[PDB]
Structure 1
Amino acid sequence: SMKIDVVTIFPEYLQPVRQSLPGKAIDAGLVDVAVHDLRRWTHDVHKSVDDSPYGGGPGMVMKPTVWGDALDEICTSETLLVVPTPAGYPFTQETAWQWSTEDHLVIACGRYEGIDQRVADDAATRMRVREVSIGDYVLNGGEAAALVIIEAVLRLVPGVLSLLEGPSYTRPPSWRGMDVPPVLLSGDHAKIAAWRAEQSRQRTIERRPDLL
């Protein structure tokens, strides 16, 4: 039973998450995913969510007052507040396992240069807060990271949906002059696992030597 709240100035960007949720997991009450438009908590008629950064520099910073109101309404003390950011701790598979058992996740999606730091600092005095990054590249905002995080976490929730894996093959046995490696049709399953382990080692050495 997990509730996920996403807060964003582009709620439309989260459409694919609602498209990938099975009706049975929802109706069995295993998961609920709500998306909230941040501008619902703005204070002015211009619906301002950003302002110039103290200290100068390019770009804008999301206003603490607007985010404070949104999180105040949506979070409780039991909430896990996830804040995507290019300067976060790495989001990995272990992170996903750990979060997959939470009752309530709130994902605060920023834009521009990100969110006034006091928002997270304030939230952390009464709930668990995690600033994370989904990888070493730069995005426009937190929304794509939210999709990735939701997908990686939810697929580890029952019934919701070391080395690199080597190549896989299926039918037909021959295709455009390429044969499936004969060892896979040998019926020697110890030897098949050895071949796969060695493909796995070579691939890891070639593509991800850092893991070794």
Structure 2
Amino acid sequence: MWIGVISLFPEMFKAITEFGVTGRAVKHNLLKVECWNPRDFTFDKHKTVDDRPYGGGPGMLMMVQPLRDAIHTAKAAAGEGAKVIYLSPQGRKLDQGGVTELAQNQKLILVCGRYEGIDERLIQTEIDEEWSIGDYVLTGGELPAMTLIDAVARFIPGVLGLLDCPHYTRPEVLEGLTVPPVLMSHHEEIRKWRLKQSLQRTWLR
């Protein structure tokens, strides 16, 4: 799988490409993540990446020209069939069904916004889909993009409905707490199944 990323902080993506299961996927050439920074597409001395909203009010938007140019460079690296995803608080809320759908794509381009977001017309001209990772306020689209990468990477071949029952490992006595004698005795898929149901009944419905 190939993933293109547009971000003002591309170095954040080292958390994905250098470590753990995604890092191992990168090392084994099962996953490739390439980043482009709108800052690198600026023409002015101050490398301006923000711009004022028409209609006023507080907040800024991503400046159109550096952002659009970075997207175009990612699209040229991707080639045909790359789906362009805008990480947005106004997007479809990610769940495992959404992850399964997004993981059918061999190529993705993930656009990360800063400030109050991006010009509405850029959504029409450049974006295929908008996605949120949850109903909470973040400072940008980078942690959502990284979260999406990790979730979809699990679907790449070679990379790898109730509340779980409690699980125990060594020692037998931990802070005076003992392991249920049943585990250590059989199977008996319950008490494991019975505890999984008991925990589901007493805590979440």
TM-score category by the smaller chain? 0.7 to 0.9
Classify 1:182/1:136 alpha carbon distance in 2 versus 1 (closer, same or farther; 3 Å).
Answer: farther
Contact 1:67 1:119 (C-alpha < 8 Å) held by counterparts: no
For the pair 1:102 / 2:105, whether they are aligned, the reply is yes
Deviation digits for residues 167-190 of structure 1 (CA, Å, limit 9, x no counterpart): 321111221111122333352323
* 1:137, distance to aligned residue in structure 2 (A): 1.0
Contact 2:163 2:196 (C-alpha < 8 Å) held by counterparts: no
Distance in 2 (CA, whole Å) between partners of 1:42 and 1:199 is: 59
Distance in 1 (CA, whole Å) between partners of 2:121 and 2:162 is: 40
Residues paired across the two proteins, number:
200
For 1:122, give the aligned amino acid.
T
Alignment match, 2:12: 13
For the pair 1:36 / 2:57, whether they are aligned, the reply is no
Alignment match, 1:60: 60
Distance in 2 (CA, whole Å) between partners of 1:183 and 1:202 is: 21
Percent of matched pairs sharing the same residue: 38
What are the ranges of 5 or more consecutive residues in structure 2 without an aligned counterpart? none
Distance in 1 (CA, whole Å) between partners of 2:74 and 2:102 is: 18
Deviation digits for residues 72-128 of structure 1 (CA, Å, limit 9, x no counterpart): 22224511212111121111112212222311111111111111121121124xxxx
Alignment match, 2:92: 89
User: Which secondary structure does the structure 2 equivalent of 1:85 belong to?
Assistant: strand
For 1:90, give the aligned amino acid.
K
Classify 1:26/1:188 alpha carbon distance in 2 versus 1 (closer, same or farther; 3 Å).
Answer: closer
User: Which secondary structure does the structure 2 equivalent of 1:6 belong to?
Assistant: strand
Q: How does 1:1-212 map to 2 (within 5 A)?
A: 2-20=1-19, 21-22=22-23, 25-26=25-26, 28-75=28-75, 76-124=79-127, 129-160=128-159, 162-202=161-201, 205=204, 209=205
Distance in 1 (CA, whole Å) between partners of 2:16 and 2:27 is: 16
Classify 1:52/1:161 alpha carbon distance in 2 versus 1 (closer, same or farther; 3 Å).
Answer: farther
TM-score for both structures, normalised by structure 2: 0.86
Classify 1:203/1:87 alpha carbon distance in 2 versus 1 (closer, same or farther; 3 Å).
Answer: farther
Distance in 1 (CA, whole Å) between partners of 2:187 and 2:50 is: 63
User: Which secondary structure does the structure 2 equivalent of 1:119 belong to?
Assistant: helix
